[PDB]
């Protein structure tokens, strides 16, 4: 998102507004304002790694902006936004992830080296790899009798068609010692 | 395995009676060891369970998505509105005797992927089988009856 | 399948690292264990 202190009504501010948004949840509900327009209006920019070097990116769009004239004792302690130099904001931090982690719940709560593992085992679970499978003559292929979209999910899963093509089932777990097996 | 590098294989399989249980009736489908938690550190695992134990009862989809505004303190309150311990734990009676378990358990629905790699595709045993030509030693691989 | 398509290679102790420049463009976690590790990045 582009920031530009373009506010003759305040301070620095995302060129994009809640009017552009609901203008999308408009065409969104139509299933003429694509992503091609979000770019043809200078509301978003394509930053390669090089150009990145000379910009200042704000994480959370909200918080890293309005002034200050207490806090929850639960959430993770967040630093600040002591700067007004910002040039761009992050569509969403949970976008620095790729297909793999996108299915991992609370990857921001596990030892990183573990996430990296699940990042691999996923490519080895069972499910449905296509629906036409019943008309496919490929060597080896497995379909989980009954799938199940998870009881907990990533907003990102929504683009990974995961809810319609789960990699598992919701088992009634029980973390305890018993037979010692 | 779950979605937390919490991979494991089956050691045995018990039934409903033999299984440990909770007053409600509800019984586990899976019993993983408390020991796979302390050093793995994968805690989100513990969280997905709690959250999912609520989404189970509430019918609402439970978001686990990365950096959001959802906390362990919050979910725990939502689980207390439904009826069970604010931390998940439940009382359980040992399936063999019926006597309660001196302890409580982290009983809660968690997603589990059934990774490929089933035993019967690996189990292999040989005693004097197809011998190689050049060497005259056994042959390689379980598929060609190797050794 | 998704994962497979969004994959990258790198012909052969410093390259395998997760550099800063990697933020946003490549996933920090998904990457093969042992052997080639860090020489294979996903978007």
């Amino acid at each position: 998102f582009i920031v530009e202190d373009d506010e003759s009504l305040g301070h620095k501010e995302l060129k994009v507004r809640k009017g552009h948004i609901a203008k999308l949840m408009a065409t969104e509900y139509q299933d003429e304002y694509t992503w091609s327009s979000l770019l043809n209006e200078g509301l978003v920019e394509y930053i390669d790694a090089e150009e990145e070097e000379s910009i200042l990116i704000a994480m959370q769009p909200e918080d890293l902006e309005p002034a200050e004239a207490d806090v929850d004792p639960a959430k993770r302690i967040r630093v600040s936004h002591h700067a007004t130099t910002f040039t761009h904001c992050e569509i969403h931090p949970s976008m620095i992830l790729g297909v793999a982690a996108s299915i991992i719940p609370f990857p921001d709560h596990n030892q990183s080296p573990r996430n990296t593992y699940q990042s691999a085992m996923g490519k080895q679970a069972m499910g449905v790899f296509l629906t036409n499978y019943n008309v496919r003559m490929d060597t080896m292929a497995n379909i989980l009798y009954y799938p199940q979209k998870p009881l907990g999910t990533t907003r990102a899963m929504e683009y990974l068609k995961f809810r319609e093509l789960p990699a598992g089932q919701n088992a009634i777990v029980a973390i305890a010692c018993y037979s010692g097996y | 395995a779950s979605r937390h590098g919490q991979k494991g294989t089956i050691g045995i399989t018990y039934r409903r009676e033999d299984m440990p249980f909770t007053a409600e009736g509800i019984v586990p489908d899976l019993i993983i060891n408390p020991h796979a938690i302390p050093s793995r550190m994968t805690v989100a695992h513990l969280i997905e369970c709690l959250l999912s134990k609520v989404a189970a009862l509430s019918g609402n989809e439970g978001d686990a998505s990365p950096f959001t505004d959802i906390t362990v303190e919050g979910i725990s309150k939502l689980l207390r509105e439904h009826g069970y311990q604010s931390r998940g734990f439940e009382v359980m009676y040992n399936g063999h005797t019926g006597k309660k378990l001196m302890a409580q358990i982290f009983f809660g629905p968690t997603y589990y992927q059934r990774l490929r790699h089933m035993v019967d595709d690996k189990i292999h045993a040989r005693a004097r089988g197809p011998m190689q030509v050049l060497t005259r030693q056994p042959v390689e691989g379980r598929s060609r009856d190797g050794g | 399948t998704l994962s497979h398509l969004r994959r990258t290679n790198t012909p052969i102790a410093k390259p395998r690292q997760l550099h800063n420049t990697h933020w946003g463009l490549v996933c920090p976690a998904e990457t093969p264990e042992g052997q080639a590790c860090g020489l294979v990045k996903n978007l």
């Binding site: 809640k18 949840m25 992503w35 569509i91 | - | -």
Partner: peptide, 30 residues
């Protein structure tokens, strides 16, 4: 107010907007 700030829960529609148009495998095809 077709002109106001933009919360977090908003940025999602933008992203939705992204895949509606590019799709997971943009790169390859493009």
């Amino acid at each position: 107010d077709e002109s106001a700030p933009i919360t977090a829960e908003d940025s999602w529609a933008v992203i939705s907007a992204f895949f509606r148009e590019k799709g997971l495998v943009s790169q390859q095809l493009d």
